[PDB]
């Protein structure tokens, strides 16, 4: 990867991780 | 959450986890 | 959907749309 | 972008577009 692509992917990864974490918390919070 | 919403979010979560993992592997694979 | 689930999904959608747009712009910007 | 990065991002984009579309359909399907 180019530096620029690396940087971009790093920022994408951080955002996706945050979203995934929000979904995971919501699922975990469910009374079954 | 409704069952339907729970199910939907579960499947979304699984897909996002797979994508995040692909990005993480690509980043990790970079010679600095 | 519950109001809460609707609200959550709305915010998720907005974030994903922003990410997708960033990727699309990067791809479009490529000299082939 | 490298060819490899371009290819990767293309596939990521396709997957995200599919997910976003699923969320959008669910939201649109809601009786208010
Ligand atoms: Cl550079
Ligand atoms: Cl550059
Ligand atoms: Cl950047
Ligand atoms: Cl049901
Ligand atoms: Cl139902
Ligand atoms: Cl489903
Ligand atoms: Cl409420
Ligand atoms: Cl509530
Ligand atoms: Cl919220
Ligand atoms: Cl190559
Ligand atoms: Cl290569
Ligand atoms: Cl590939
Ligand atoms: Na719900
Ligand atoms: Na690159």
Residue numbers in the entry:
A (entry chain A), B (entry chain A), C (entry chain A), D (entry chain A): 1 to 32
The authors write:
Here, we probe the mechanism of oligomerization of a peptide representing the CCD of the STIL protein, a tetrameric multi-domain protein that is over-expressed in several cancers and associated with metastatic spread. STIL tetramerization is mediated both by an intrinsically disordered domain (STIL400–700) and a structured CCD (STIL CCD718–749). The STIL protein plays a highly important role in mitosis by regulating centrosomal duplication. The CCD of STIL is necessary for its self-association.
Two-point mutations (A722L and Q729L) and a double mutant of these (A722L + Q729L) were designed. Both of these sites are predicted as d positions in the coiled-coil heptad repeats, and as leucine (Leu, L) predominates at these positions in natural coiled coils we changed the Ala (A) and Gln (Q) to that residue. AUC-SV experiments at 10 µM for these mutants all returned solution-phase molecular weights consistent with tetramers, and at 100 µM the data and fits were even more robust. A722L had a cooperative unfolding transition with a Tm of over 70 °C, and Q729L and the A722L + Q729L double mutant did not undergo thermal denaturation. CCD mutants bearing these two substitutions as well as the double mutant A722L + Q729L formed very stable anti-parallel tetramers, which could not be dissociated under any experimental conditions. We also solved a structure of Q729L to 1.66 Å resolution. This revealed an anti-parallel tetramer, which we describe as a dimer of dimers. The interaction between the monomers in the dimer is tighter than the interactions between the two dimers. Likewise, the packing in central portion of the tetrameric bundle is tighter than the ends. Aligning the Q729L dimer to the L736E dimer resulted in mean RMSD of 1.6 ± 0.5 Å (over an average of 58 Cα atoms), indicating that the dimeric and tetrameric states are more structurally related than the biological assembly of the previously determined structure of the STIL CCD (cyan).
